[PDB]
């Protein structure tokens, strides 16, 4: 109960979400998700984690796009 409270708060801030995401990843893969869903309060904490995670996913994906400027540098400077 305590941890996803913290990760929820951490997830809100873009400067600290990355730590939160990996901790969430560890739990999902080292626990029975059925037990997780049964614990009271997970769903309400899990409510808040979806939107911010999606916002982070929409971002960063855009940054990889801005990386593809570099292909233009290589191909152009190759010419």
């Amino acid at each position: 109960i305590l941890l996803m409270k913290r990760c929820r708060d951490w997830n809100t801030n873009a400067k600290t979400h990355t730590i939160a995401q990996r901790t969430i990843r560890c739990i999902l893969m080292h626990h029975n998700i059925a037990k997780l869903s049964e614990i009271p309060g997970m769903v309400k904490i899990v409510d808040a984690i979806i939107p911010y995670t999606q916002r982070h996913f929409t971002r960063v994906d855009n940054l990889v796009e801005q990386s593809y400027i570099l292909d233009y540098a290589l191909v152009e400077m190759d010419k």
Partner: protein, 98 residues
């Protein structure tokens, strides 16, 4: 679009999960054809929406696991398109701007 959904939950969920295994191989074969891509992809999404809990509960089952693995073995191949789309718009986003 309804009739596609009218079925997909109607697929049976006992062990040995033959039809689900059968249906997965259909999308597996369909992807190999490289035709009707979007329709085949969205069909698999609806599968997880309707029977994802069924799959996860028995993910250790050999028959289902093998079918999923083959679908991944196909599905991994079509990640090239991700590179091509993701490249062009960035070059586009730059070319108009700078």
């Amino acid at each position: 679009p309804a009739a596609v959904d009218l079925e997909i939950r109607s697929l049976n969920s006992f062990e040995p999960f033959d039809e689900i295994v059968w249906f997965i191989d259909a999308l597996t074969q369909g992807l190999k054809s490289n035709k009707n891509f979007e329709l085949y992809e969205t069909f698999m999404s609806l599968l997880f929406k309707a029977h994802g809990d069924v799959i996860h509960a028995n993910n250790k089952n050999q028959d289902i696991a093998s079918a999923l693995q083959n679908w991944e073995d196909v599905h991994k191949k079509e990640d090239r398109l991700d590179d091509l789309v993701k490249f062009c718009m960035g070059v586009a986003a730059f070319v108009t701007t700078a």
